Amino acid sequence: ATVLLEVPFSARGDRIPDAVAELRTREPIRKVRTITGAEAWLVSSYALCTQVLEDRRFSMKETAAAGAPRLNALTVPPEVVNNMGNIADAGLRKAVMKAITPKAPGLEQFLRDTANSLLDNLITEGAPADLRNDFADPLATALHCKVLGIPQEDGPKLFRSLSIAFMSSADPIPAAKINWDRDIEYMAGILENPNITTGLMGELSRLRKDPAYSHVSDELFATIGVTFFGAGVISTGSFLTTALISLIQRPQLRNLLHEKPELIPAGVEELLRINLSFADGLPRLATADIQVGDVLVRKGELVLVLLEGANFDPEHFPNPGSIELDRPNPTSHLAFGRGQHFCPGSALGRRHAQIGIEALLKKMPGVDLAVPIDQLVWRTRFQRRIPERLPVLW
């Protein structure tokens, strides 16, 4: 007697389990048990993953409903699962999205300067260097402070909420609320701080005092800052970290991008496609009975969209495990999701990784792992897959 297949399959972010391809082939929508004990449908083909993500009847909002089958425990207030809907309802979606593009004057230079400064410090200190804790995450953190308009020196404290905020836990996490409430208070103070005039929080601080937004809650303004800082920092830091691994493990690609940095955008797009940073399928709750492949998903059931199921689907990306800079459909992966909840920070996330990689390859053209790959320690029960340290030499 066997138990129902458990998700997630593996917290390792350096390789996809052979099991995913067998699952996709045999049962692209399959029942699984999540860490809470709930049952769910795990969708692992490109076609079915896009179907689910493009059908809003598979609702993100409704995953927060009391009594729903859960992937993991909420680490935010339930109304925050509807964060982008709340932002849209408040009339803030266009301004938010405009503030988080990589387009602001000087932002890319700041990113480059920050990356180069981080790297110089690593070079000064001498190998081995930890490229997660001492490069990718600080770069993500610095970027998001700059984007939000908040002091760089406030970044580390906000950052250290994230090892708990993005836990994938069977049970509510006491520290998540402590940190959430504290971080909200911080962002509320930011909105009241007259020195904060730039970035997302500077713009929100002005809109908050504009009569066209006088009935938007202060809670939502503060929430936008906390949520965009955290989702952005965890996602860019984790993605860049695991992209660096994939790059370091491909010396020929490393050398090609070092030699021809104009291919870095195509290389990052493939690193996005093969990225295993999201540790769990994206969750959605059926609000109707909906046919997905051979399964009639019933109203109230949980569906988990396995990004790497889609992104390594050979029917969509031939030779899926190979980084190919000349694919005909290069941005068609689901690394940034798809549909209603497509990542609003996609461009910023691309540029963060492009600039970080560009700077790394210039400063450390010899970069290599300083430990055997198997020695990386993969964070467990977390919504991202990340090695706790990424020791390199160069």
Ligand X SMILES: Cc1cc(C[C@@H]2NC(=O)[C@H](Cc3ccc(O)cc3)NC2=O)cc(C)c1O
DSSP track, 128-158: -EETIIIIIHHHHHHHHHHHHT--GGGHHHH
Q: What is the DSSP-derived secondary structure letter of residue 167?
A: B
Does residue 141 touch ligand HEM according to CB under 6 A? no
Q: Which of 52, 136, 348, 376 binds ligand HEM (CB under 6 A)?
A: 348
Residue 81 binds to ligand X (criterion: CB under 6 A): yes
Is 284 within any annotated ligand binding site?
Answer: yes
Secondary element (H or E) of residue 311: helix 307-311
**Positions in 236-255 near ligand HEM (CB under 6 A):** 236, 239
User: Does 299 count as an annotated binding residue?
Assistant: yes
Cβ pair 86, 184 in contact under 8 A: no
Helix (H, G, I), strand (E, B) or coil at 58: strand
Does residue 8 have a cis bond before it (omega within 30 degrees)? yes
Known binding residue 117? Answer is no
246 binds ligand X (CB under 6 A): no
Tell whether residue 309 is a contact of ligand HEM (CB under 6 A): no
Is 277 a binding residue for ligand X by CB under 6 A? The answer is: no
What are the tokens at 151? 């002091």
Q: Is 187 annotated as a binding residue?
A: no
Tell me which residues in 280-299 interact with ligand X (CB under 6 A): none
For residue 126, the one-letter residue type is: G
> What is the contact mask toward ligand HEM in residues 198 to 237, using x (rule: CB under 6 A)?
-----------------------------xx--xx--xx-
Check binding of 383 to ligand X (CB under 6 A): yes
The reply, when asked if residue 145 is annotated as ligand binding, is no
DSSP assignment of 76-97: S-GGGGGHHHHHHHTT-HHHHH
Number of residues that bind ligand HEM (CB under 6 A): 22
Strand pairing partners for 367? none
330 preceded by cis ω (within 30°)?
A: no
Q: Which residues sit at the interface with ligand X, rule CB under 6 A? A: 60, 75-76, 80-81, 83-84, 165, 227, 230-231, 383
Q: Which residues sit at the interface with ligand HEM, rule CB under 6 A? A: 60, 83-84, 100, 227-228, 231-232, 235-236, 239, 277, 282, 335-337, 341, 343-345, 348-349
